[PDB]
Design a protein around this ligand. Structure first.
Ligand SMILES: [Zn+2]
Ligand SMILES: [Zn+2]
Ligand SMILES: [Zn+2]
Ligand SMILES: [Zn+2]
Lengths: 359, 359
């Protein structure tokens, strides 16, 4: 099974990385144990959606391409290693973002930096190591692969887009004209930058490149199948599915219970440019806008409750259903376009969409 | 002149990175200005020793190798770009280490995260971007170069060694047998791990790979001159010069005035495994060891003054002069060995040593 193979490769990559630290980096057993626990705590426990997408894409191509059995195993092992590069990249982001945001919980457990024997002093460097491990994996497992350069160059571009998206995300509540390293950043009072286009820019860079584009293209690269798809369609369909995925997450941060969500949602307190805030501002009357301005971006629970009450009374379920119906049309249109060059890849995209649409 | 060329390339790399953010990453002018100021503040103001080493190594080879003028300019431009990759890598380290350590000053100015309009929330991601910029430079400027893969693989290995060295450094005051993510880390009471071999391990990984090995090998790679030197000698001479460089820094942290140093030294308060602490423990009597244990790793200025008094009374200048005389013998021995295959490269190493020995 796909999952069973994916998790087995985790054991092999972990053993490789820790054994190399022993043989080449003069690590002592206690520090190797610290790093093993750090890797398990930060990389495991999620659904592995991103990593599994590489595996699923590669499985789609194996079903229709002639290969020796040893080659089928090599491609699947490459898809698992590539999937783990993305999961470790995500682990790097989550560790650093939780420190950046002062987050309390992640995957129902404390954020890594909050573990007693970790602290921010270690955790920032642990997050750096998680990303360095992605490059050590690539150079070791893909040393002789024809796709090595394309995969490293794609991974680098996606990682950079993600860091730019993090900048767009954490500065989304400030007025662009007031950004200045020398001056403490006040929260916007006009919310003029809470628009659908600005929100789409945040999401495109902060989430879509590493969550959808990267696993899909990595699946194509380990399959030596990129010159079989129209890359502009892959980009357009990744950015559409990714935006939809983030809109679902934005809704959950506010309305999904803390136990089911795994963390207490703070987008309102943090004054984030969320789908709820943008969509609310896209339909509110003057009085509702004024009430939103007087309560948004404050830690005070009474003001948070006012914002949640404005969202609930604003019937945002109607806007969400209208957005969803539109995304369904556009995603189906793009899947259809993907069938011209590759019905196999289009089917993999259909599965990725189905898995996103239902969660 | 070498410096004039190096700084001119900074302008070109900066323009390239910011223009690409505009044309490909949908950046707005205010965020591009934030990032320009972040790049200038974190990358400029130092001596550019690491970056200049790549340039100097490449200049050494140009003096003895036949090339068209356009090729000489291309090699020098490649050496400057490669030098800037190392300076930006250092900038990434300094930004994250200052956050990790809660440092106040850097290069006589506040640490980046302390700027009013930055904050840790942005600065951790700014440090990530600085390292991502090193990869964007490499893929853009060296796209068609024969040395691209060797340079990227070397850079990745050095960066990973550095992050491992940071882990060794920040955990150097804890007992290895007590490292555990679940348990808050107490400072050692026995100081059994304050040994010359353990100190050499910290320094080798945290400093020597990125400060000496990387600039020397990058100089060889942009010169297409690696298969002209014995790589085991380059590694041995980089780790010797690097260790000497770090011992000088350790002495300065304690005895160099805060104004000349640029920051208030805190190695004693931080209980760092410094050359002074290891060397002191290598010659102290039982009473002196007991006094050191009762005062080391405490923020209290009276206890700090006791440790400084123990160091001053311990005549560590004698140990330093004996260490220096030994390093002089060994570095000269390695330079001599380097002349068998390349008198040109040995001369570049002699210059690197001279520049380290005098500062
Ligand atoms: Zn965040
Ligand atoms: Zn969220
Ligand atoms: Zn440090
Ligand atoms: Zn120091």
């Amino acid at each position: 099974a796909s999952m069973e193979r994916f998790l087995s490769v985790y054991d092999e990559v972990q053993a490789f990385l820790l054994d190399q630290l022993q043989s080449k980096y003069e690590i002592d057993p206690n520090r190797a144990r610290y790093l093993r626990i750090m890797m398990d705590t930060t990389c495991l426990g999620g659904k592995y959606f991103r990593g599994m997408t590489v595996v699923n894409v590669a499985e789609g191509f194996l079903a229709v391409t002639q290969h020796d059995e040893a080659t089928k195993e090599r491609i699947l092992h490459d898809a698992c290693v590539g999937g783990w590069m993305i999961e470790f990249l995500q682990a790097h982001y989550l560790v650093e973002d939780d420190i950046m945001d002062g987050s309390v919980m992640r995957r129902g457990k404390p954020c890594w930096y909050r573990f007693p024997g970790v602290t921010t002093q270690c955790a920032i460097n642990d997050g750096i190591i998680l990303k360095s491990w992605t490059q050590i994996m690539a150079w070791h497992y893909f040393a002789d692969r024809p796709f090595l350069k394309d995969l490293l160059c794609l991974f680098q571009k996606v990682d950079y887009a993600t860091a730019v998206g993090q900048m767009y995300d954490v500065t989304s509540m400030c007025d662009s004209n007031k950004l200045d390293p020398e001056v403490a950043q006040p929260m916007t009072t006009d919310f003029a930058e809470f628009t659908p286009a600005i929100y789409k820019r945040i999401v495109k860079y902060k989430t879509t490149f590493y969550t959808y584009l990267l696993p899909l293209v990595m699946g194509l690269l380990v399959s030596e199948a990129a010159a079989s798809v129209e890359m502009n369609l892959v980009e357009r369909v990744a950015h559409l599915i990714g935006e939809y995925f983030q809109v679902q997450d934005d809704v959950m941060d506010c309305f999904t219970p803390p136990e089911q969500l795994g963390k207490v949602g703070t987008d309102i307190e943090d004054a984030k440019c969320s789908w709820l805030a943008v969509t609310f501002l896209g339909k509110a009357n003057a009085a509702q806008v004024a009430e939103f301005k007087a309560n948004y971006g404050e830690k005070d629970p009474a003001k948070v409750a006012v914002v949640k009450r404005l969202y609930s009374k604003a019937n945002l379920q109607a806007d969400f259903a209208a957005y969803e119906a539109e995304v369904v049309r556009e995603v189906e249109s793009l899947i259809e376009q993907l069938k011209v060059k590759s019905p196999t890849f289009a089917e993999s995209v259909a599965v990725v969409w189905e898995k996103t649409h239902k969660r």
